[PDB]
Design a protein around this ligand. Structure first.
Ligand SMILES: Cc1cn([C@H]2C[C@H](OP(=O)(O)O)[C@@H](COP(=O)(O)O)O2)c(=O)[nH]c1=O
Ligand SMILES: [Ca+2]
Length: 129
């Protein structure tokens, strides 16, 4: 996989973010994770964690997997990085997202994220408390 440039347009919630990619605005949905909705428990905390990570990043990047690049709603499907740190992994490691939506052929980082989830769960963090 390859990281590509993007700039923040605006934070949305724990697992969606609006970015400018190849000069066009797009909503991205983070691969392999599920955060609570804003109206659910840990939803506000997941939203805040993603917002801080992407707003504080000097360099945002998009990494597509090998399969579908957009979903049925027209959202981009990617791994999102801020200053080299994966947002998708970071959410899971903090117990703010579950590993989820693992479709065959867009699952390169699955085992990395399941190892972060095991660690969050062992530490009883957030969703796992
Ligand atoms: C993360 C992900 C979600 N989706 C679709 C499945 C779900 O369909 P439904 O809307 O029919 O439930 C929806 C979950 O996204 P949200 O968790 O953002 O609601 O997005 C994909 O098709 N591919 C993906 O990789
Ligand atoms: Ca969600």
């Amino acid at each position: 996989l390859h990281k590509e440039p993007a700039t923040l347009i605006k934070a949305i919630d724990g697992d969606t973010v609006k970015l400018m990619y190849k000069g066009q605005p797009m909503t991205f949905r983070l691969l392999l994770v599920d955060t609570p909705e804003f109206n659910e428990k840990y939803g506000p905390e997941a939203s805040a964690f993603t917002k801080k990570m992407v707003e504080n990043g000097k360099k945002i990047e998009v990494e597509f997997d090998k399969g579908q690049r957009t979903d049925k709603y027209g959202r981009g499907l990617a791994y999102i990085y801020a200053d080299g740190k994966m947002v998708n992994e970071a959410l899971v490691r903090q117990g703010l997202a579950k590993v989820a939506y693992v479709y065959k052929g867009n699952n390169t980082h699955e085992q990395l994220l399941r190892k972060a989830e095991a660690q969050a769960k062992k530490e009883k963090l957030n969703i796992w408390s």
